[PDB]
């Protein structure tokens, strides 16, 4: 078993004033709330016990949206981050939830998509030691954690938002950890940025030779909804795929069902209330259509 966390707080300042009305993680990416996407990432990694961390004001809305997750065969729990003082705080806030288990953290505004993503998640999730992170070639690596490799392809340094990146490979917002993470987070001090950085967590594993950095190839989409423009692009991306395929990206209900965490009758039940719109009609179609 691994336990997962979604970090779905922050201010969403870049998204002002849209986010005055509410969390960037409840606004829609095309047809469904942003949070569905990372939730689904965790689900596809075989994780069913998940803690959602948000701001004090938006926590209740997540709870209304998602509940305890039992309807979807999950065990969802909630905690508050008082202030967005770093990714690594997820491990302090979530210490008791983690207990002595393997864990995973996904950022609330990250969206992933691509052929065999299930396998890429499984590989990381099934490991039982160290840390795993994913490196993705981006245009503006300065906005992210940046991994440098040597000539042989081995990662040699990490830097958080460097003005002068040492490569174009960003560390994405998905991280898998062994039982060493909590203790590492606890010994962290705030960065000059004023945050407890996930990059310092990861450097600590790197230093001990225990960070696995796996390339996420160009054939995958890793997007993030942090800007007005990026959020619209993500929306359009999802739209184009779903209207082409007649299939939906990141339907928790679908994923649950395919993973056998809920059964046909349960799914039919989930569909009923949503039946007056296309999402409901889609859940129903899933009962009598085989999709490879």
């Amino acid at each position: 078993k691994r336990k997962g966390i979604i970090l779905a707080g922050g201010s969403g300042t870049r998204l002002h004033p849209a986010t005055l009305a509410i969390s960037k993680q409840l606004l829609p990416v095309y047809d469904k709330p942003m949070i569905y996407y990372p939730l689904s990432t965790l689900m596809l990694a075989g994780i069913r016990e998940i803690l959602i961390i948000s701001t004090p004001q938006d926590t209740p809305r997540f709870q209304q949206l998602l509940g305890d997750g039992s309807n979807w065969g999950l065990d969802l729990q909630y905690a508050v981050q008082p202030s967005p003082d770093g990714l690594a705080q997820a491990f302090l806030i979530g210490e008791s939830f983690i207990g002595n288990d393997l864990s995973a953290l996904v950022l609330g505004d990250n969206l992933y998509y691509g052929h065999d993503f299930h396998e890429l998640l499984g590989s990381a999730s099934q490991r039982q030691t160290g840390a795993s992170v994913f490196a993705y070639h981006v245009l503006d690596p300065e906005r992210y954690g940046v991994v440098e490799f040597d000539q042989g392809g081995k990662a040699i340094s990490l830097e958080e938002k460097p003005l002068e990146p040492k490569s174009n490979y960003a560390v994405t917002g998905l991280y898998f950890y062994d039982q060493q993470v909590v203790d590492i987070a606890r010994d962290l001090k705030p960065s000059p940025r004023g945050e407890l950085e996930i990059t310092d967590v990861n450097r600590a594993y790197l230093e001990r030779g225990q960070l696995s950095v796996e390339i996420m190839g160009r054939g995958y989409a890793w997007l993030d909804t942090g800007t007005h423009d990026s959020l619209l692009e993500a929306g359009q991306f999802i739209a184009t795929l779903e209207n082409r395929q007649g299939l939906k990206v990141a339907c928790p209900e679908e994923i649950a069902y395919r993973q056998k965490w809920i059964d046909a009758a349960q799914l039919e039940k989930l569909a009923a209330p949503l039946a007056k719109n296309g999402y409901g009609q889609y859940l129903k179609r899933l009962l009598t259509e085989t999709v490879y």
Copy 2:
């Protein structure tokens, strides 16, 4: 003086599950909350005393977002609609707010844009008799109120969502009324749809020869965000204009400044808490730029 009403309730069924998260009128259109758009419409019609109607769960969140309106030189009030039992219910809920004044109703998910919109609005709003509605050529008139004209261009019938529309002219979700509307709404009975219909209101006016139907030409954009696809498209439309012009559509702060409802000093104050993003930067820039 004319008083305004924003109907910002409904279930937003077509946007499920995105709207299980929050009211459709709190979702963004590109860069700002949907409600900014109809609010701006009323503002551009010279209306500053506005009633916002929403559901029992969301009415307070709109209150949370916009407060009493004084920071923007407006007088905003709030009322709850217990069930989305029809647009015409705005006049019963809003009966005491209206008093013996002229009124205007704008729908929460309607977005307008175009050259001389201010003039178009002013003309309807400055009339002191009958009713005024706007007729816009659409692809799928079956989804709206439809107005049929004689050979002479005079409006001769209205039908709500006809299976066989008599024309391609839709009645947009903006309505201006004299003192007769409250009594007309109070006598309406539910339609076969189970709704108290604005179309029936407008018909009563038409029957007494007191309905002005003005054409809103093809040069204007009238959009509604009722479906996932249309919400996205409105987002892209707005983004294209804004990214081209370096001007923003339906920024209430800007419009209030321009109508002299607030002065330079007030605007500098509104910009301050927003200064860390592009939207606050833009309000600041307006203090030192003449825009024609």
Copy 3:
């Protein structure tokens, strides 16, 4: 009697490799060739006699697409620009075509759209002395002819691509001239960047107190297809309008019919060969539907 010129040449080094295949003005913007847009602008300005300038290689193409114009009630003529040595060259190449008449120049990659644009063009067209241009607020004025206004809104200076723009107002690619333009253009010497600049022609009028600069308001859309991104956005812009309205933008046959330049009968013959697709069906519908 005013004659039109469409300047549709230009290096394709930029949008290479897209434009290695097809010159820019032959590429579509959503559903019809780019040149339809500026062609429609001239038509909406009441101009029937039009000269299309392209590269030597592209003139046959333009001719194949458009012909002599007679089927749309136009008089189209063609000329070549060997080298893209400046917009003002259009008046040297077009000297014989213009003769002793008033003229208008439109850029081949410029798309305009908005309420009462007809009336806007008319105001410039009716002026018989001097020149008329339009000013549009843009995000990146450094990329255009920039017009500076004094505190009372009078145009006081023009600079082509200033490093330090004096305003955010661009002079758009739509220019109206009296009889003086050809001699002005003859006297011009190339600018530092080596082009015979339209900005210089406009300044010659300005220095004589004969330049009328009109504001093209923010309710108008003025787009150019100069970048991959900007072409894309212009495509989505037209698509949203067209799909919303069930009406099409810059359809020359429609414009010609509305202007009485061709009759019902002529339009039905234009429609027949296009009848298997949407565009021909749209033209047919125009025959049986009144559009205000």
Copy 4:
């Protein structure tokens, strides 16, 4: 040894009037001509010897855009298809080019993208007996060749544009064939639509138990640029990927270099004439960056 064919002709039919001036396969998909996309698919499949088939009027245009291929390490040949009389005509027109070799056909308006596409292609290319095709779940299967599967996942029938489709799986425009294909195509009679159908070619192999139908999973994008709306969607799709990643899709120069069909000296010589725009800057960057 497998040879390739791109079929890049076609009525033009619809996209009128966008395609009066030129063929659909020369239109840009965001930043490069559409033909680059299927061209790159064959390249990614390890195919260097390719035949491009088009119309009398367009074949030349393709030749001018791409030449003989030698600068990209390719051997490109051209042939004309007099009338768009069916996809299986490619095997007639292409008979001498193919000789006794294995072959692959791709449709000129098909765009594929996804993680491990190269491995997907390889799998099919390495099967030297019979045929291989791909099945992709779509919303409107009635537009395509449709493939039906039994309860156990085996392909059991094909139907071209069926009125009542038996599944939602379309056969994509990418086909691998052994030596039997030419004769199979030779023996075909046109269908009740008037075409020599690839679906009949495919059926022929199926009826011999020699058709391999592989699932192309939902993690892949398979788009058809055959409508106005679909071309725009594909453009946005590419743009979103390229702008997020700083890597281009279907850049033949890159693919050639990565396959070692050209060396760095060659790649630099290709970058030179494009150096004044982003495209050439990208090529140059590829000489000094490792991309995984």
